[PDB]
Amino acid sequence: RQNLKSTDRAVQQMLDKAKREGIQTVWDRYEAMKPQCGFGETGLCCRHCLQGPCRINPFGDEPKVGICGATAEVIVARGLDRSIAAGAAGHSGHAKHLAHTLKKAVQGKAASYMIKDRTKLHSIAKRLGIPTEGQKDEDIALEVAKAALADFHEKDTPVLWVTTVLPPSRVKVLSAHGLIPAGIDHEIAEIMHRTSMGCDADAQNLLLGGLRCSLADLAGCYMGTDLADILFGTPAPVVTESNLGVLKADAVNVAVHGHNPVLSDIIVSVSKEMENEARAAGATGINVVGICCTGNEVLMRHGIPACTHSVSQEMAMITGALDAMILDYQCIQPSVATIAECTGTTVITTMEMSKITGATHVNFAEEAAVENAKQILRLAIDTFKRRKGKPVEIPNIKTKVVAGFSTEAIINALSKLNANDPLKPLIDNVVNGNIRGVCLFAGCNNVKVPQDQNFTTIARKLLKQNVLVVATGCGAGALMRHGFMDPANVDELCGDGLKAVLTAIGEANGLGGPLPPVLHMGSCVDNSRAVALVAALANRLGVDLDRLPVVASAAEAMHEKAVAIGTWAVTIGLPTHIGVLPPITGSLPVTQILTSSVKDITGGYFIVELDPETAADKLLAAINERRAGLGLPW
Amino acid sequence: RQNLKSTDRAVQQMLDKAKREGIQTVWDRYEAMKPQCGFGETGLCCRHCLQGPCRINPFGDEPKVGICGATAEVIVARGLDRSIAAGAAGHSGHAKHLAHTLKKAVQGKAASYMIKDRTKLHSIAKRLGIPTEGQKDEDIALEVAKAALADFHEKDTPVLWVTTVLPPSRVKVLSAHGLIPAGIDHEIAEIMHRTSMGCDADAQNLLLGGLRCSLADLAGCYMGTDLADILFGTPAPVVTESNLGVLKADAVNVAVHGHNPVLSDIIVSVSKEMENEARAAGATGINVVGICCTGNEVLMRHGIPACTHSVSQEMAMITGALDAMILDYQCIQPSVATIAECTGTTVITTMEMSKITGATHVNFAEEAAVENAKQILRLAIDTFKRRKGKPVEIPNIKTKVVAGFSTEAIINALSKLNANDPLKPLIDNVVNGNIRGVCLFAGCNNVKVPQDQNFTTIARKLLKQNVLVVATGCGAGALMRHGFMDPANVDELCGDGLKAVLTAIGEANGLGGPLPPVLHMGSCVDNSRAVALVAALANRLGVDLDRLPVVASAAEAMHEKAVAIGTWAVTIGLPTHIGVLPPITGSLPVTQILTSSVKDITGGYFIVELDPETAADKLLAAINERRAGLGLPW
Numbered sequence A, B: 001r002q003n004l005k006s007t008d009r010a011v012q013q014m015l016d017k018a019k020r021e022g023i024q025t026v027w028d029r030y031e032a033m034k035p036q037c038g039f040g041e042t043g044l045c046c047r048h049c050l051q052g053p054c055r056i057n058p059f060g061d062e063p064k065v066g067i068c069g070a071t072a073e074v075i076v077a078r079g080l081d082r083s084i085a086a087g088a089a090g091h092s093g094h095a096k097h098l099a100h101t102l103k104k105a106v107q108g109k110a111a112s113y114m115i116k117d118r119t120k121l122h123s124i125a126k127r128l129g130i131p132t133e134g135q136k137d138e139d140i141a142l143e144v145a146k147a148a149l150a151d152f153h154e155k156d157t158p159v160l161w162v163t164t165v166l167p168p169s170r171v172k173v174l175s176a177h178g179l180i181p182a183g184i185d186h187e188i189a190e191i192m193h194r195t196s197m198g199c200d201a202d203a204q205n206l207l208l209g210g211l212r213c214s215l216a217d218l219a220g221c222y223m224g225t226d227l228a229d230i231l232f233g234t235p236a237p238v239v240t241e242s243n244l245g246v247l248k249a250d251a252v253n254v255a256v257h258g259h260n261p262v263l264s265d266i267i268v269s270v271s272k273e274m275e276n277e278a279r280a281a282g283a284t285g286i287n288v289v290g291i292c293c294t295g296n297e298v299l300m301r302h303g304i305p306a307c308t309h310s311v312s313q314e315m316a317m318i319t320g321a322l323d324a325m326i327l328d329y330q331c332i333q334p335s336v337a338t339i340a341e342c343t344g345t346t347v348i349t350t351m352e353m354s355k356i357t358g359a360t361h362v363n364f365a366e367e368a369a370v371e372n373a374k375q376i377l378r379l380a381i382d383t384f385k386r387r388k389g390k391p392v393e394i395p396n397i398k399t400k401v402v403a404g405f406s407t408e409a410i411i412n413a414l415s416k417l418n419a420n421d422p423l424k425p426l427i428d429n430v431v432n433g434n435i436r437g438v439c440l441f442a443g444c445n446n447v448k449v450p451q452d453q454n455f456t457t458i459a460r461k462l463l464k465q466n467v468l469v470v471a472t473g474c475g476a477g478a479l480m481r482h483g484f485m486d487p488a489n490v491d492e493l494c495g496d497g498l499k500a501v502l503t504a505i506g507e508a509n510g511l512g513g514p515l516p517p518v519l520h521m522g523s524c525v526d527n528s529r530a531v532a533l534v535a536a537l538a539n540r541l542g543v544d545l546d547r548l549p550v551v552a553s554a555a556e557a558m559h560e561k562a563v564a565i566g567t568w569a570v571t572i573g574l575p576t577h578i579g580v581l582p583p584i585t586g587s588l589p590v591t592q593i594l595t596s597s598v599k600d601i602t603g604g605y606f607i608v609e610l611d612p613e614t615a616a617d618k619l620l621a622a623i624n625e626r627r628a629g630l631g632l633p634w
């Protein structure tokens, strides 16, 4: 039964096709891996030196300790810290790329890029303390780019993409515990050092370092969103579609996959100039579709329809209609390069540090972006021509998606109810119980969990209990593909209080109907937008984030990046659910820190719960405990 | 039989004591780990996301590929790259600490530190291009410290502690392959990114990134040596002793253990001012002894005797006479904190990012170094008092050690034969066959190998074949403890040609006898001194390093740092032996790159050989192939 693999009907249909065609999928590779190693599952394995591999039995007799003397506590904490550092390295590497792109753009070195959002640029400069009065925009932008790059290393200030984005009282709590990062790449390196053999060997000390590195990840996320908004525009509400039915047999279908809008944004613009060239080849046009975060980026800004996400990404190929898959980095199953031989798809890498054996590599340079995009799209057009006459099987399955809810857009929507105190109508409805609290869904799909099952099960229970639900990344992807971003489903999905608020906001925005059930706040770096919203609420209320009825759920987490995000959610003060097991259960002391005693440090805490109906109850309890702490009914 | 555990008789004696006293050692923890996991041993395990753990059978049936599609090639290369990045993070973290210390010293913020080697400071400034004429030393030093810190991040120049230390022709080869690092912490982060899930998935591309990150490690090593020489003095020839017999029952015995001379150098100086305070407590004085690299640092500069190294570090404690073990970071078995409860030793950590549960922590600040050192040494004095009346068992085993052969010191010794062309007498004797070639022994001991057995077996064979042998780190430690640094053993150990050269140099230096059989070039960062010597020889000859009859051997390697060092030795052009299995054999394509096709990229290559008599033959063949390529007899 394909329903045990994915709850998405389009994915189920393509799983049937892959099976009859003998094309191995992620689910088949998972089945072939079972049973998985219990040492790795519990975190009780270490390969940090050539005396290893070392392992510790979770229970029973020897081995009980690593060869060097490393305890279970130490081994588990060191492994977790390296995962946080790896996640930080990815989000902040993405941000660094955008900083260099902005710098090039304003220095005259990359004319395909420009300041598109001047309002965003000036507001970021003001937040950072960079003067704007009497300065040319290009000079302000150069200073912002230089400040972004300076946050990667030690200097006379800490990381400003932490200290300028959280309220002073939160920064103070963190500073008292030594948790403010000194530099993003500095912290990543310090983790790698401290976790190497014969260094840090105290679980609490190790985990404090991990919390600090998670804040370096947050800075990378926030910097990425900031810079992408300057370069490509801050999102506003947009209407599009999702799921495999957005592919079109009669078009050149091009997926943008990976992460950085420096690549996907140009593919979108250049594809429109090439419509007549695609038509000369017998297509109707070029149909750009999204996969994973770079898909979210172009969905949020341009309404490009999302094809699929995360674990099911191979299924777009199995249709037979995917002419090209254009990749930068992160979250791309390398299986795509071999599946392409069977499906005909042209898989194209573009970044020097992210190649896949068997894929075609087209170097992308920001200095030649338009030229490089045309070379890529001409490969896609050629591939379309080669499938002239082949039947394709595109499931006729799609949902309507309203998205584009940046924090600026949410504030603007609320301002239609209260022009000069936009956050107040949200707060009023929390106080009166029409909004019980807020839950951010974030993160990936994971082959261990039937695809989307945790996201939808938890979201349904929260929505019925009047929780305002926001989402990013492939959590937003799951919810969009199951109709949670279609305002036509508000009546079915939402409790009466939440429906009343979504309707009041929507009617004030001229929609004649509500906002959607779930607000799509963007890509995974755009988890930083949720931070901006929550920090703005905390500041408006004069309380810290750990007193707000706000929770997060990485319900189906996979990537090291999702571990980093969950960790900074805890660090900034949120109850944070994770719906898969991180490799921590082999140490009860480490588990106790992450799920309990960190409350006394940051006010946040992990909630590890694999059963989604139980997870929803635990998330509601966390929200309601925060309501009670504010003196509110619940 | 303790000879299967260690070839060091003092270690054997303490293993007997530990056994009868029920104190578990590293060897016992290794026995309890057997059989070790074959997936980890071969590199065929991945835990880079929460879909894992993934494994690949080396041979047979499924699993054959990771869940995301990662091949054996990819998994092996990604794991290796993360080990290189971790090694870079340690050596360069050490260097960064020294850069901040020098900066503080010359800004008036840390008066226990100063410019001790003004000649070294000016020569480093000249090498970097920093002007010195008409500048105050403190201003030159501030500029050098600032340049050191700038090499950690991207800027308008590549990493100068690579490009200014290798000859232009070598830099050109590396640059053509994209291998020059852009910034030290930048490269570490880029490795962590590219090796995270769904990123780089091409073995050759991954390994090129690893070679580049290994050059970031080299820069950290060279920067560490440079800055420590400025602050603490460039080594010159010194005579001391090694092995456990350097402990003294009637003294306060204090081991300095870990890595950074910012800590050990001050412990040495302050201990002398506290002699009368130790005597009031009934001791003869404070006897500072070394373990691991920080021991090597104070041995090289001050003649502090070395107690033990690497795998046998617990044995110093088992004597019952070790009153304190003063730690900073790296290579410290965390077992020491629990062994201390049985032996009475006071284990003291000092660095915020390297704590050990159960050890006493005394924060060390460079701004208060002397005060903090006295607090630490008073704990040691108190511990001595508590063992009044307890028998101790110090093996009466020690060797004489001549050390202090910095590259400056080697050039100066050679200059007694040829004042204005000091390298020429060395080259002349290579040409005439009195010196067959040069071999650098480097790296750790590893519990899998009977301690020291590979270092001594290989060195004996090379010395008899007239190879000039230099050593660093715990390879120098092994050789010193077995008499290879005592000039009285030249007749026994050295071939006639090598004896003739060591005698000619020694007699010209007024010794009435030879240089020692092996030249101790210092700590592990001081592998950079061997680079300086080899680069100077290459420059004098007008050839690149990959034409010289110079090889390296990490004969008993353990730490991620040793993997990084071996990798940069290959990258700079050396045949590089490793005497333990790195986790690569699960991929034949990766093994073939590292042992064969990298020759076409850098001219260097790994020689993986666990049998030391065979390794010696392979190293001699590599030397002789280089002689033949220069047209020399062999």
Ligand code: SF4
Pocket (backbone or CB within 6 Å): A046, A047, A048, A049, A050, A051, A052, A053, A054, A066, A067, A068, A069, A070, A075, A196, A197, A198
């Ligand atoms: S660091 Fe310690 S626990 Fe890890 S592999 Fe090495 S000896 Fe084993």
Ligand code: SF4
Pocket (backbone or CB within 6 Å): B046, B047, B048, B049, B050, B051, B052, B053, B054, B066, B067, B068, B069, B070, B075, B196, B197, B198
């Ligand atoms: S990155 Fe790929 S091979 Fe590694 S644990 Fe995740 S699914 Fe498995």
Ligand code: FES
Pocket (backbone or CB within 6 Å): A037, A038, A039, A040, A041, A045, A046, A053, A055, B037, B040, B045, B053
């Ligand atoms: S023993 Fe299986 S993850 Fe290491």
Ligand code: FES
Pocket (backbone or CB within 6 Å): A037, A040, A045, A053, B037, B038, B039, B040, B041, B045, B046, B053, B055
């Ligand atoms: S399966 Fe043993 S190292 Fe992972």
Ligand SMILES: [Fe+3]
Pocket (backbone or CB within 6 Å): A259, A292, A293, A331, A473, A524
């Ligand atoms: Fe993502």
Ligand SMILES: [Fe+3]
Pocket (backbone or CB within 6 Å): B259, B292, B293, B331, B473, B524
């Ligand atoms: Fe060392």
